[PDB]
Each structure stands twice: as structure tokens, then as C-alpha cells.
């Protein structure tokens, strides 16, 4: 079970695909889609 093992690399690729799927969800909460902030509680206490 090392880097030269292709099947083991495929196992790790499946795990990494799962992790990337979760990470994309966790990463878009910091995005600011053309707004003044990404936190709803911040824009609430700053504008009208």
C-alpha cells in the first residue's frame, strides 16, 4: 500500500472526491456575490 499502487490511489481518489464535494459546499459561504459582506448579520446592522 504505497504510491505505486494504482488501486490504493483509486481508493484515495474516491475519498478525495467525497472531501472535495463537501469542501465546495463549505467554501461558498465565504463568497460575496456582489454584496458588501458575506455575513447576513453584518449587512443587517449596517444598511436600511
Amino acid at each position: 500500500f504505497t504510491t505505486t499502487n494504482e488501486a490504493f490511489q483509486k481508493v484515495q481518489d474516491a475519498v478525495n472526491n467525497n472531501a472535495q464535494a463537501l469542501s465546495k459546499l463549505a467554501s461558498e459561504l465565504s463568497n460575496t456575490f456582489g454584496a458588501i459582506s458575506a455575513s447576513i448579520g453584518d449587512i443587517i446592522q449596517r444598511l436600511d
Binding site: Q45, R46, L47, D48
Partner: protein, 48 residues
């Protein structure tokens, strides 16, 4: 503190005070006056 002395200048000769690092308690100022018209644009009058 410099706001509370002398003859305040006319409108076209308004003096300026720029604060780039400090902690401000505005109501500790507005308590010293009798506020008459608090109108704000691009941020709520309470949000300032």
C-alpha cells in the same frame, strides 16, 4: 474636544476633523447638544 470652543466657522469655511484611529462614543457628544434633525443617507441614523 476642539468642537466645544471658539466661534464655529460659517458654512463655506467648515472646519474638518479626521479620525483614523480612536474609539468614539457619539451620544456622549449629542447629549451635549439638543439634536434637531438627524438625517442620514447610505446608512441608517441608528447605525451610525
Amino acid at each position: 474636544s476642539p468642537l466645544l470652543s471658539g466661534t464655529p466657522p460659517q458654512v463655506y469655511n467648515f472646519k474638518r476633523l479626521v479620525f483614523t484611529n480612536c474609539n468614539y462614543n457619539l451620544t456622549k457628544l449629542l447629549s451635549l447638544f439638543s439634536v434637531n434633525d438627524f438625517t442620514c443617507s447610505q446608512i441608517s441614523p441608528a447605525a451610525i
